Amino acid sequence: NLPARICRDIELFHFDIGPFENMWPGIFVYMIHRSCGTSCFELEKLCRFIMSVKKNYRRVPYHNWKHAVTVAHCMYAILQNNNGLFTDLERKGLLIACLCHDLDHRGFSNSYLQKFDHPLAALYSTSTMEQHHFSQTVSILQLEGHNIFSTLSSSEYEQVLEIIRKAIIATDLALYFGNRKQLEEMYQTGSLNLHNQSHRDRVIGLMMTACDLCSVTKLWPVTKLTANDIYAEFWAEGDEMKKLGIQPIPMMDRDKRDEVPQGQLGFYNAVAIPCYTTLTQILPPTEPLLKACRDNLNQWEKVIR
Ligand SMILES: COc1cc2cncnc2cc1OCCc1ccc2ccccc2n1
Ligand SMILES: [Mg+2]
Ligand SMILES: [Zn+2]
């Protein structure tokens, strides 16, 4: 059972999951039980599932088991603060999608895989890693005793896998730019309709970006240390690009590491702030994410001064 400090702090958007890995599963179960119900998943089956998902995450600096659970917590926080909007099945599927959304990530982008001519890129031409993460998710469900949706009907099962599939694919940031533009026009024309399945899919997609990006919504000491992990992977991919005979983009070039603050400014401007701004417009209780993003932009501006 959860420590009293975590019972309180877990409800904050800026919660950090801590360095104790054996606690992360209990944190996720509590999150599922609080959002979905304890009558929802059989405990042993869900535990079996969680530990296999863990096992198929890699020892990479950033896109690891910790990140999975952190993205799921952000989703939990969004869902707790917007009671009545999402169905039980949506809530179940979104938390599970978040836990799985980076399954078997190698710390390299879709662009590197394409350039490498990895087998996976011939299989999945667009959103390569994300199609793979979802394939992995399915393969784990299909393991003996790992089907956490076994009490659902065939229909609900197909429905929740579809919810999971679109949410994982939406974690391909390449898709976020289009999705956010569609959403922003819907907002401003008064045309967003959460009873329209295609609009609903968009909002969920944006929630998935928001959760996936949530390092920028933590308090600054957390945000600042997390950027160490993010760049550790980007710089490794840049080393790999150099080895293919290809100049990496500056973000991945460790020789341009002094330009990190400027690069962070760019990201907050072009991606993070518009993301949380659009999210708060659709879901006003998500405002603390946007406030914390702005605070972090200011800190990056301070670093530059
Ligand atoms: C919190 O920071 C980031 C989170 C991400 C999350 N997903 C995908 N890309 C992400 C990128 C992020 O920042 C990289 C920003 C960036 C851009 C150009 C750069 C050029 C040179 C040096 C550093 C740079 N940094
Ligand atoms: Mg990803
Ligand atoms: Zn992720």
Question: Which residues' Cβ are closer than 6 Å to ligand 1?
Answer: 173, 213, 215-216, 227, 230, 250-251, 256, 259-260, 263-264, 266-267
Taking the CA of 233 as reference, the closest ligand is 1
- Asked whether residue 102 is marked as a ligand-binding residue, the answer is yes
Write the residues followed by a gap in the chain (C–N more than 2.5 A): none
Give me ligand 1 centre to Cα 264, in Å: 6
CB atoms within 10 A of CB 225: 12
Nearest to 130 by CA among 163, 158, 102, 98: 102
Give me ligand 3 centre to Cα 65, in Å: 10
Amino acid at 258: D
- Asked whether residue 105 is marked as a ligand-binding residue, the answer is no
Cβ-in-10-Å burial (0-12, 13-18, 19+) of 245 comes to exposed
Amino acid at 90: E
Distance CA 239, CA 278 (A): 35
Distance CA 274, CA 278 (A): 6
Structure tokens at 236: 């490794």
Nearest to 130 by CA among 174, 95, 172: 172
Q: The domain spanning residue 43 has which CATH number?
A: 1.10.1300.10
Distance CA 51, CA 65 (A): 10
Lookup result for tokens 């429905």 = 159
Residues within 5 Å of ion ligand 3, judged at the Cβ atom? 102, 212
Cα angle for residues 269, 302, 214 (degrees, 5° grid): 45
Coil vs helix vs strand at 40: coil
Give me ligand 1 centre to Cα 265, in Å: 9
Can you tell me which atom of ligand 1 is nearest the CA of 260? Answer: 23
Give me ligand 3 centre to Cα 305, in Å: 31
Nearest to 36 by CA among 75, 80, 92, 74: 92
Distance CA 213, CA 109 (A): 15
Backbone angles phi, psi at 11, to 5 degrees: -85, -10
Cβ-in-10-Å burial (0-12, 13-18, 19+) of 56 comes to middle
Q: Which residues contact 162 (CB under 8 A, 6 or more apart)?
A: none
Distance CA 101, CA 130 (A): 7
Nearest to 40 by CA among 86, 4, 93, 79: 93
Distance CA 198, CA 300 (A): 36
Task: Evaluate the CA torsion angle 169, 194, 77, 266 in order and state its sign.
Answer: positive
Structure tokens at 158: 């197909």
Any idea which residues carry the catalytic annotation?
Answer: 63
Distance CA 269, CA 260 (A): 14
Structure tokens at 127: 């959103």
- Asked whether residue 117 is marked as a ligand-binding residue, the answer is no
- Total domain count, the chain: 1
Stated in angstroms to one decimal place, the resolution of this structure is 2.0
Distance CA 129, CA 9 (A): 33
Containing structural domain, residue 270: 1-305
3-state secondary structure 139-167: HHHCCCCCCCCCCCCHHHHHHHHHHHHHH
Lookup result for tokens 């009558």 = 39
Coil vs helix vs strand at 7: helix
